[PDB]
Amino acid sequence: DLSFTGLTDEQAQELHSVYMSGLWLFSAVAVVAHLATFIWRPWF
Amino acid sequence: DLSFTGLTDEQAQELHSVYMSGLWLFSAVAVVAHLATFIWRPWF
Amino acid sequence: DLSFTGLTDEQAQELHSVYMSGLWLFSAVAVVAHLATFIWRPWF
Amino acid sequence: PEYQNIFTQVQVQGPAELGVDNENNLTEERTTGTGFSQLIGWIGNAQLGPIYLGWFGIISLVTGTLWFNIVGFNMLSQVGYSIPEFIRQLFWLALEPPSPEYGLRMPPLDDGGWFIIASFFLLVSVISWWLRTYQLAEMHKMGKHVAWAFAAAIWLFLVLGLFRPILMGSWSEAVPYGIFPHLDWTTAFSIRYGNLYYNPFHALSIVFLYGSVLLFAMHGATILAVTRFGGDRELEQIYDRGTASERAGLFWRWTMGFNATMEGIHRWAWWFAVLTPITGGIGILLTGTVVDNWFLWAVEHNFAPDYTQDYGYEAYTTYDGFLGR
Amino acid sequence: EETFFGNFDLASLSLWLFYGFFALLIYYLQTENMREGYPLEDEDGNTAANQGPFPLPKEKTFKLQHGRGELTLPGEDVQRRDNLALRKTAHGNGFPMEPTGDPMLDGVGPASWSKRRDVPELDAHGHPKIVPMSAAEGFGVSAGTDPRGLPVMAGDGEIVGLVSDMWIDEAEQLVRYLELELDPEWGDGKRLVQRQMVRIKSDRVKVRSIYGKHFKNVPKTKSPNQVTLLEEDKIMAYYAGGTLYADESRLEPQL
Amino acid sequence: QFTSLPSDALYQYLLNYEQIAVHDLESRVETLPGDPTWQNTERTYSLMNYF
Amino acid sequence: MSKFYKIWLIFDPRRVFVAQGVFLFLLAAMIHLVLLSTEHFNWFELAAANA
Amino acid sequence: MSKFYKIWLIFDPRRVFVAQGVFLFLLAAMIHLVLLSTEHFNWFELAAANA
Amino acid sequence: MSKFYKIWLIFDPRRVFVAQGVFLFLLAAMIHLVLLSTEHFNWFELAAANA
Amino acid sequence: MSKFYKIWLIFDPRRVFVAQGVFLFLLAAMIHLVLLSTEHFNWFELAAANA
Amino acid sequence: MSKFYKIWLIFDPRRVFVAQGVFLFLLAAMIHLVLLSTEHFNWFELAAANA
Amino acid sequence: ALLSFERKYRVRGGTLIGGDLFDFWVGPFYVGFFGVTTAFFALLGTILIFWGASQQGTFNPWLINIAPPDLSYGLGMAPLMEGGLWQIITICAIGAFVSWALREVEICRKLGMGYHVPFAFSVAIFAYVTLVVFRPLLMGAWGHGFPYGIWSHLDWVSNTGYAYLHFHYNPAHMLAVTFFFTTTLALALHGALVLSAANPPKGEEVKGPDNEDTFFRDFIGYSIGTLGIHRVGLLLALNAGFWSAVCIIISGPVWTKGWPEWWNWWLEMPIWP
Amino acid sequence: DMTCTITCWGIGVLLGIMTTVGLMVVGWSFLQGAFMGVLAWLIVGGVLAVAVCGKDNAEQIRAEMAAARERVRGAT
Numbered sequence A, B, C: 001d002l003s004f005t006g007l008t009d010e011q012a013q014e015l016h017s018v019y020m021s022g023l024w025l026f027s028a029v030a031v032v033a034h035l036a037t038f039i040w041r042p043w044f
Numbered sequence D: 001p002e003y004q005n006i007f008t009q010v011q012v013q014g015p016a017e018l019g020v021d022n023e024n025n026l027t028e029e030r031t032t033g034t035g036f037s038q039l040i041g042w043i044g045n046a047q048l049g050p051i052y053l054g055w056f057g058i059i060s061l062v063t064g065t066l067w068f069n070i071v072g073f074n075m076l077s078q079v080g081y082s083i084p085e086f087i088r089q090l091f092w093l094a095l096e097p098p099s100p101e102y103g104l105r106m107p108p109l110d111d112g113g114w115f116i117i118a119s120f121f122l123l124v125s126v127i128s129w130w131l132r133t134y135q136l137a138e139m140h141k142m143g144k145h146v147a148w149a150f151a152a153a154i155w156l157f158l159v160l161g162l163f164r165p166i167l168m169g170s171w172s173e174a175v176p177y178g179i180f181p182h183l184d185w186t187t188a189f190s191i192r193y194g195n196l197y198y199n200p201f202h203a204l205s206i207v208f209l210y211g212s213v214l215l216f217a218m219h220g221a222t223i224l225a226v227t228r229f230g231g232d233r234e235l236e237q238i239y240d241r242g243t244a245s246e247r248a249g250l251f252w253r254w255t256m257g258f259n260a261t262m263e264g265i266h267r268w269a270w271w272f273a274v275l276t277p278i279t280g281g282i283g284i285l286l287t288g289t290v291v292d293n294w295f296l297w298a299v300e301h302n303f304a305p306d307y308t309q310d311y312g313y314e315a316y317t318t319y320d321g322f323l324g325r
Numbered sequence E: 001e002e003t004f005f006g007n008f009d010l011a012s013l014s015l016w017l018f019y020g021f022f023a024l025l026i027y028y029l030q031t032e033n034m035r036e037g038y039p040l041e042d043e044d045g046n047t048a049a050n051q052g053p054f055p056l057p058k059e060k061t062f063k064l065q066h067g068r069g070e071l072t073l074p075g076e077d078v079q080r081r082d083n084l085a086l087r088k089t090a091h092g093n094g095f096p097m098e099p100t101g102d103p104m105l106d107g108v109g110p111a112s113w114s115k116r117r118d119v120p121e122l123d124a125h126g127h128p129k130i131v132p133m134s135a136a137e138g139f140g141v142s143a144g145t146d147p148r149g150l151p152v153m154a155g156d157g158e159i160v161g162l163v164s165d166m167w168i169d170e171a172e173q174l175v176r177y178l179e180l181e182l183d184p185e186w187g188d189g190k191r192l193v194q195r196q197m198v199r200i201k202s203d204r205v206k207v208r209s210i211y212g213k214h215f216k217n218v219p220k221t222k223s224p225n226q227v228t229l230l231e232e233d234k235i236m237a238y239y240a241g242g243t244l245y246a247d248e249s250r251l252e253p254q255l
Numbered sequence F: 001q002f003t004s005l006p007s008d009a010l011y012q013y014l015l016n017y018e019q020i021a022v023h024d025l026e027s028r029v030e031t032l033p034g035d036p037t038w039q040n041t042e043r044t045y046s047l048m049n050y051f
Numbered sequence G, H, I, J, K: 001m002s003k004f005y006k007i008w009l010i011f012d013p014r015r016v017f018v019a020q021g022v023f024l025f026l027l028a029a030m031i032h033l034v035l036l037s038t039e040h041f042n043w044f045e046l047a048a049a050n051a
Numbered sequence L: 001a002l003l004s005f006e007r008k009y010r011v012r013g014g015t016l017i018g019g020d021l022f023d024f025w026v027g028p029f030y031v032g033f034f035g036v037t038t039a040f041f042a043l044l045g046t047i048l049i050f051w052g053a054s055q056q057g058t059f060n061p062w063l064i065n066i067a068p069p070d071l072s073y074g075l076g077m078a079p080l081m082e083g084g085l086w087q088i089i090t091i092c093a094i095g096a097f098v099s100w101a102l103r104e105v106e107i108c109r110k111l112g113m114g115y116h117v118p119f120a121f122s123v124a125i126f127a128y129v130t131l132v133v134f135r136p137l138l139m140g141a142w143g144h145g146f147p148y149g150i151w152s153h154l155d156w157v158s159n160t161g162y163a164y165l166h167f168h169y170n171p172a173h174m175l176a177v178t179f180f181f182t183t184t185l186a187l188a189l190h191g192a193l194v195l196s197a198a199n200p201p202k203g204e205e206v207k208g209p210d211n212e213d214t215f216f217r218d219f220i221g222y223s224i225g226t227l228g229i230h231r232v233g234l235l236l237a238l239n240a241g242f243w244s245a246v247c248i249i250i251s252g253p254v255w256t257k258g259w260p261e262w263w264n265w266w267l268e269m270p271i272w273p
Numbered sequence M: 001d002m003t004c005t006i007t008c009w010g011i012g013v014l015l016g017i018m019t020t021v022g023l024m025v026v027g028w029s030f031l032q033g034a035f036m037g038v039l040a041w042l043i044v045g046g047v048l049a050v051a052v053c054g055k056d057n058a059e060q061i062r063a064e065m066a067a068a069r070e071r072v073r074g075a076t
């Protein structure tokens, strides 16, 4: 089982879950902002 | 349990609680300031 | 077996499968974007 | 304050060193006789001499003295053999290259013939000093880094005086032998071909000259700060790492995120210094032969700035208002 | 003169060729300077996950003089210290360490020395390079003020002993060390001071780095006629550590 | 004007009619015999110092 | 994919998070500045014009 | 979203707090100067004009 | 081919991954900027023309 | 909000007070100078003009 | 031709692979850029003239 | 990540101000009080430069130009678009440079070394403050400083030299150019000598200082030594930067005419017939 | 005796300052008088640091050293 960082498989799964959860909220906020911007000044 | 800083589970929850309480006192003040500025000189 | 990095055959195979999955996903997203852009403003 | 190590506190003197030897027998051609200067010894070594005399050095010295005397005697004769006027106008006189009408043929002695004879003696002198620098490393059983670094500057020397005039088709493209007259040549060369600022290889040469001076300030200062740990004995630090090298490396690592080694900093210094005349010569060789106006070249290649405001003093003030009337 | 295509002429070709050459030269120069101190490690002595963008260089060999052998780099660290009295002040990386006992006696911090070879450095003839002046044929003080016989004053204003001799480098004709005989009240025996840490005046010789009470713990040479590289490193580091550890006010912020 | 530039100006320019311009009006031109050189540029520089 | 979580068996999170934060802030600043360099999307000037 | 506190198992608060303290004050100073460099939103010039 | 995975028996994954991450972003930025320098594909000017 | 005292469990007050004093004085000096750099809010010019 | 495989008994594959990758990308970029400098093969300008 | 020998040097103490509030490392970089002030000033300056570039209308690195104000504004403050951004960026740059020097001082104090490097950097700071603060104050307007642009700060140099007709004839510029050329010749020689001593022909042993001293006395009859060469290099570099500052501060506030005319004192000395 | 050398160089600096002011009273300009002042300093101060500081103290010591140099020669 290859590992350069010293982490285990279970630790990596636990970290990735929270990372993805925090990455989805940022995308949702960006999507809402882009929709508001398109409604004020369309670009397409 | 993964811990690079050496903190336990409960210590991290305590620190997070207080941090997030200062993020809301800073956000509320910013929101009031932005409302006053928009009433004074709109930009949208 | 020849090995300059220190991995074994099984580790290399496992790494390559996960690499190829992300490569295909990236390519699919790029393909969709390219088709939409061609529909909007064709070249050729 | 603490001692800073710029001047030696106390000097000691012993028997004069005559040098190392091997099977090549360097002693046979070395002069006997040495001196000591206590004024210099406040900064560096106090011993003076001895020197090695081979055939390359003797030929170089003789042919370089000949060049100097052809120029000096021509300068003296231009003034009517008047010594006080010769002294008065020393910085202004020169031995002028030939006129453009003669091409690459041999000009009259009054109009560049002595300039060509003297240029042939300076050429011979310089190439002989370089063969001496190569032979001495070979005889000392060392590397040839000094000779290569000297050839780097000889490249620009030859480009200025030999190669570019031949490719341009006139001996009149060479540099005059004078103090002020040679500086007038620099300004006129820059003006004639647009603006030499916009020659990219001139900019690269300036980059490497600035970099070489920044590196001796950094290297000299760094070595003087670790002399309390024996840091000026660099070769033994290379062969056996000590705390001086470690502290010197860690200073720059903590300052700017990367560092060098005791041996590897000298490669950095060697390359920055060597790269200045190479890029300079490549830049000079492209002028007139390829590009005739460097500002128009910059406009063509889109790195020439543009200005919006107007030109003229009366767009900003009044002649009466500048005098106080 | 003509162009090859568009605006591309001979000057552009030369410029791009120089760009490529300079990129290769930067790669070579950065790779050449990685023969000491690698691979990288973390604050617990283990190999670090990150090793940077450049790979390590291949090996070079140096043939040493006087039958000392060969040196191949990059290789193992032979100058590594074994048991350092240090303590972590944090659980992760990026924070300082604290001495466990006496920092000046334990050789840590600005008092750290490197484990060099336990032999003196030689000159061209195979003889020790640094020799006391009382055994150096033909040498004398030719300029400046002679410090032999003058008293030595410490950083807190105490007289600790007298200068007895000077140790000189005969090949380069330079003074390297001053030899001090201690008074019985401040210790016993003889000690050395490197020349770059003293100020020689008309009536005294001043050493500001350390105090009087620190003069008995200066490391001592084994032979009275020669000094090895390891002893040199331990003596010089001891004096260098006093600039920070002599007084508690030298370590705290000066503000 | 306190320099070593030619003292021939004001006689070839303000008494006779010789060309003062020296610049090439293209980025790359084919240089011919009889075109201005840096020697002419120094005479123009002397005249401009006089100005 | 289901195995993407293995990326943390190769890269250390401490460095990755810092690099990603720097990259994201720089990208946001670049885009916000590019919008202000045009005429149709400069909101400071639009607010002055509809004054 | 409820497991965000685990960020303090990765980063020590001492470094993060000083980084955030520098970042926030830098942002504020910049927006005030970008605002001060326009015609519509310079509040020092508005008090002079409205007077 | 079915034996391409052996590329990871020659190259270290970390150095390759960092280099590819830099290369892809630089290439994408270059293409997005090349499109913005033309007349037919600059969407910012197209938006103003159709407004 | 009632547990903000714990900031003194992370940062040493001795080294925080000096930095806060320097910051406060520099900010006050900058603001006073910025006011002095204008026409409407320069109180040295106003007294001369009014009287 | 059967014995070309012995080229790997002379050259180290780790160096050759990196050099080949850099060379291939640079050559492809140069060709693509040379095509855009002409008029008959510039597809961005061809698209504008066909609309 | 640390080097193989770095851990024993990473101790606490040796700060001018801040104590252990900023006593740590980020990656290889050390931060202290002056590491926080450097980051703030440098980031503010760069962000303002790019905002000015956005308002100018071009993002091309060759063509970005932020310029000082007109001479009619004197020593006062100009509107932020007509030259005030230049003033703010100048203040930020001065702060960043001073913080960099004071950070180097703390690193030197922690490592137990001499303070030669910050002292050497102070000379380059002095040449820059002469160009943007001292000459402009003496001449009476901030508009005498050079602009912040890669290719537009060469136009300033060209126009400032022809404003004195023939700048090569400036006496203190001649001294400064000589110092620059001599530093480069000495750096080349030093690097070549050390490398040739450490890298002999294949099959030979390495050389020592005796061999280096001998080669140079054979070549030119003198050898400065292994300690003298570093002193001489430092002194040459510092003399080069000091004389550069002098050449510019006399050109404006001390001399008004062409520089060739300054030589008249030599041409009309009463001794000459 | 490095302290007598520095004194002698300072008397040269002082003579140079006096040479400038003297030529200016007689009709020369500053820079003309200061070139002559620099040469007075360098020639005279140098000459005095060789001659005066080279008459080093020794009294019967001087004598014997010289009478013994006069014995080196005679068999050289």
Ligand code: BCL
Binding pocket: D126, D153, D154, D156, D157, D186, D187, D189, D190, D195, D196, D197, D201, D202, D205, D206, D209, D276, D277, D279, D280, D281, D283, D284, L157, L181
């Ligand atoms: C109006 C003036 C023009 C100008 C016109 C030129 C011209 C013309 C040239 C330079 C060149 C150079 N310019 Mg420019 N330059 C200008 C403005 C500047 C400015 C500035 C404004 O700050 C700077 C920093 C520089 C700097 C430089 C250098 C980077 C470069 C010289 C390289 C070198 O190796 O020199 C060191 C010099 C040498 C190596 C000469 C070789 C010496 C030989 C080897 C000596 C042999 C021995 C000798 C004969 C024996 C003597 C006797 C002994 C005692 C025995 N320029 C302006 C734009 N510049 C040169 C170059 O390369 O251009 C690209 C060049 O030709």
Ligand SMILES: CC[C@H]1c2cc3[nH]c4c(c3C)C(=O)[C@H](C(=O)OC)c4c3nc(cc4[nH]c(cc(n2)[C@@H]1C)c(C(C)=O)c4C)[C@@H](C)[C@@H]3CCC(=O)OC/C=C(/C)CCC[C@H](C)CCC[C@H](C)CCCC(C)C
Binding pocket: D033, D034, D035, D036, D037, D038, D040, D048, D049, D050, D051, D061, L220, L221, L222
């Ligand atoms: C870029 C570096 C330059 C350089 C430097 C240089 N050369 C030097 C020195 C220095 C600093 C000396 O001090 C030494 C010397 O003694 O010169 C008179 C010397 C020298 N360089 C020489 C050769 C030489 N250098 C060359 C090059 C160069 N050397 C460059 C110009 C070249 C050429 C053409 O490239 C040549 C041919 C000789 C002139 C000389 C060789 C030294 C020698 O033969 O000494 C014999 C010993 C003596 C007894 C003479 C010393 C004079 C006094 C009677 C001794 C007492 C000392 C007194 C107290 C002070 C006077 C000494 C002054 C130099 C300060």
Ligand SMILES: CC[C@H]1c2cc3[nH]c4c(c3C)C(=O)[C@H](C(=O)OC)c4c3nc(cc4[nH]c(cc(n2)[C@@H]1C)c(C(C)=O)c4C)[C@@H](C)[C@@H]3CCC(=O)OC/C=C(\C)CCC[C@H](C)CCC[C@H](C)CCCC(C)C
Binding pocket: D060, D061, D062, D063, D064, D065, D068, D125, D126, D129, D133, D146, D149, D150, D152, D153, D273, D274, D276, D277, L181, L182, L184, L185, L188, L189, L220
């Ligand atoms: C990499 C580029 C840099 C560089 C490097 C460089 N220069 C070098 C070298 C190197 C590596 C040498 O090895 C070589 C050398 O010998 O250095 C000590 C040299 C050298 N570079 C020199 C000059 C020089 N280099 C310059 C530039 C540079 N060289 C760059 C900054 C410049 C300029 C214009 O900036 C100059 C003026 C020489 C000192 C020397 C070349 C020596 C040579 O070829 O001499 C020929 C000799 C004669 C003319 C015959 C002698 C006739 C003399 C007129 C009189 C008698 C000699 C006497 C000793 C001088 C007078 C003094 C009196 C008191 C006696």
Ligand SMILES: CC[C@H]1c2cc3[nH]c4c(c3C)C(=O)[C@H](C(=O)OC)c4c3nc(cc4[nH]c(cc(n2)[C@@H]1C)c(C(C)=O)c4C)[C@@H](C)[C@@H]3CCC(=O)OC/C=C(\C)CCC[C@H](C)CCC[C@H](C)CCCC(C)C
Binding pocket: D210, D213, D214, D217, D218, D221, D255, D256, L041, L042, L043, L045, L046, L089, L092, L093, L096, L097, L100, L117, L118, L120, L121, L123, L124, L147, L148, L149, L150, L153, L237, L238, L240, L241
């Ligand atoms: C004898 C003086 C020589 C010298 C010395 C010197 N400089 C030094 C040192 C020393 C000894 C260092 O220790 C130090 C160092 O760390 O070097 C790696 C340094 C240094 N000198 C440097 C560069 C430099 N030195 C130069 C020259 C010289 N420095 C002289 C030749 C030059 C030039 C023009 O010739 C340059 C460009 C830096 C690489 C470095 C450390 C400076 C530094 O990092 O300061 C902190 C600031 C920042 C990281 C960014 C500041 C951002 C600003 C707020 C905005 C930018 C505004 C700017 C004015 C715009 C200019 C635009 C131009 C296109 C005109």
Ligand SMILES: CCCCCCCC/C=C\CCCCCCCC(=O)O[C@H](COC(=O)CCCCCCCCCCCCCCCCC)COP(=O)(O)OC[C@@H](O)CO
Binding pocket: D207, D256, D257, D258, D259, E018, E019, E022, E030, E034, E051, E052, E053, E054
């Ligand atoms: C475009 C990008 C830059 C942004 C644009 C603005 C700035 C432009 C100016 C200068 C750029 C210098 C930036 C250097 C910063 C380095 C940061 C750092 O620290 O990076 C290291 C990696 O770097 C290094 O190892 C050193 C890199 C070279 C240093 C600069 C050379 C300047 C040479 C010549 C002068 C340059 C003039 C041009 C000549 C044009 C020529 C045509 C990470 O750490 P490391 O541990 O060392 O890793 C390595 C190893 O160990 C693996 O293990």
Ligand SMILES: CCCCCCCC/C=C\CCCCCCCC(=O)O[C@H](COC(=O)CCCCCCCCCCCCCCCCC)COP(=O)(O)OC[C@@H](O)CO
Binding pocket: D257, E050, E051, E052, E053, L001, L027, L028, L038, L039, L042, L043, L046
């Ligand atoms: C604080 C405020 C900042 C001030 C704001 C002003 C903006 C400009 C100032 C600085 C810009 C430099 C920023 C970069 C510094 C990164 C920090 C750093 O280096 O962080 C390291 C991480 O490495 C890296 O991030 C690697 C960086 C690669 C450098 C490129 C090499 C060539 C580059 C250049 C060649 C030049 C040629 C010509 C150029 C034209 C052509 C380029 C931690 O290292 P570590 O954990 O110890 O170990 C790991 C180690 O080995 C390597 O991974």
Ligand SMILES: CCCCCCCC/C=C\CCCCCCCC(=O)O[C@H](COC(=O)CCCCCCCCCCCCCCCCC)COP(=O)(O)OC[C@@H](O)CO
Binding pocket: E049, E050, E051, E052, E053, G011, G012, G015, G016, G019, G022, G023, G026, G027, G030, I014, I015, I017, I018, I019, I021, I022, I025
């Ligand atoms: C024309 C010049 C353009 C400007 C200059 C940038 C290009 C110059 C070259 C390099 C820049 C540094 C980027 C590379 C180094 C970063 C450090 C790094 O890779 O960190 C990794 C995390 O990253 C990755 O995993 C790769 C992804 C990088 C993506 C960012 C690209 C930055 C691209 C550009 C800059 C910012 C854009 C955002 C603003 C918009 C423009 C204004 C941590 O893993 P690790 O511990 O290091 O891995 C161990 C390993 O070392 C074992 O050997």
Ligand SMILES: COC(C)(C)C(=O)C/C=C(\C)CC/C=C(\C)CC/C=C(\C)CCCC/C(C)=C/CCC(C)CC/C=C(\C)CCC=C(C)C
Binding pocket: A014, A015, A018, A019, A020, A021, A022, A023, A024, A026, B002, G024, G027, G031, G034, H003, H004, H005, H006, H007, H009, H010, I028, I029, I032, I033
């Ligand atoms: C128009 O043309 C130009 C050139 C001008 C452009 O504008 C071009 C622009 C581009 C080419 C832009 C390209 C942009 C990207 C590729 C952007 C990509 C951005 C991301 C992938 C962003 C991802 C962000 C993810 C985040 C923030 C996720 C999570 C964060 C956290 C979860 C924090 C909390 C973490 C915890 C608690 C982990 C701890 C867990 C334990 C188990 C201990």
Ligand SMILES: COC(C)(C)C(=O)C/C=C(\C)CC/C=C(\C)CC/C=C(\C)CCCC/C(C)=C/CCC(C)CC/C=C(\C)CCC=C(C)C
Binding pocket: B011, B014, B015, B018, B019, B020, B021, B022, B023, B026, G028, G029, G032, G033, H027, H031, H034, J003, J004, J005, J006, J007, J009, J010
């Ligand atoms: C116009 O466009 C331009 C380019 C000009 C822009 O301006 C672009 C601008 C941006 C792109 C801006 C982007 C801005 C952000 C991403 C901003 C983000 C801001 C935050 C995340 C702010 C967070 C603030 C948090 C605070 C204040 C938290 C806490 C404060 C406390 C006092 C908490 C106290 C904690 C204690 C005591 C812990 C003690 C506990 C123990 C257990 C010991």
Ligand SMILES: COC(C)(C)C(=O)C/C=C(\C)CC/C=C(\C)CC/C=C(\C)CCCC/C(C)=C/CCC(C)CC/C=C(\C)CCC=C(C)C
Binding pocket: A002, C014, C015, C016, C018, C019, C020, C021, C022, C023, C024, C026, G003, G004, G005, G006, G007, G009, G010, I027, I031, I034, K028, K029, K030, K032, K033
């Ligand atoms: C038009 O002319 C000009 C010049 C302007 C051009 O634009 C010319 C342009 C070109 C010539 C462009 C050429 C471009 C290329 C050749 C591009 C090639 C790009 C790729 C091959 C990209 C590949 C990307 C692959 C990726 C992202 C794959 C996978 C990533 C991941 C899977 C990440 C997750 C990885 C994990 C978890 C590792 C698993 C670990 C284990 C331990 C099992």
Ligand SMILES: COC(C)(C)C(=O)C/C=C(\C)CC/C=C(\C)CC/C=C(\C)CCCC/C(C)=C/CCC(C)CC/C=C(\C)CCC=C(C)C
Binding pocket: C002, I003, I004, I005, I006, I007, I009, I010, K031, K034
């Ligand atoms: C018009 O004129 C101008 C100047 C503009 C030109 O354009 C002129 C152009 C030229 C003169 C161009 C010349 C071009 C060439 C000579 C091109 C040559 C190209 C090649 C030889 C390309 C080779 C490509 C090979 C590839 C892509 C190989 C890939 C291999 C693999 C992916 C397999 C990897 C190997 C593994 C895994 C080994 C297995 C490992 C084990 C451990 C068993």
Ligand SMILES: COC(C)(C)C(=O)C/C=C(\C)CC/C=C(\C)CC/C=C(\C)CCCC/C(C)=C\CCC(C)CC/C=C(\C)CCC=C(C)C
Binding pocket: D068, D069, D070, D071, D072, D073, D076, D116, D119, D120, D122, D123, D157, D158, D159, D160, D161, D162, D175, D176, D177, D178, D179, D182
């Ligand atoms: C009369 O009084 C005495 C006797 C004391 C004197 O002798 C006094 C002497 C003087 C006062 C002399 C003064 C000398 C000068 C002021 C000299 C100045 C010299 C220069 C600045 C020279 C620069 C030379 C060269 C330059 C800048 C570049 C390149 C040149 C060359 C490569 C020259 C080489 C020439 C060649 C190869 C052409 C040869 C021709 C052939 C056909 C082979």
Ligand SMILES: [Fe+3]
Binding pocket: D219, D223, D234, L194
């Ligand atoms: Fe060195």
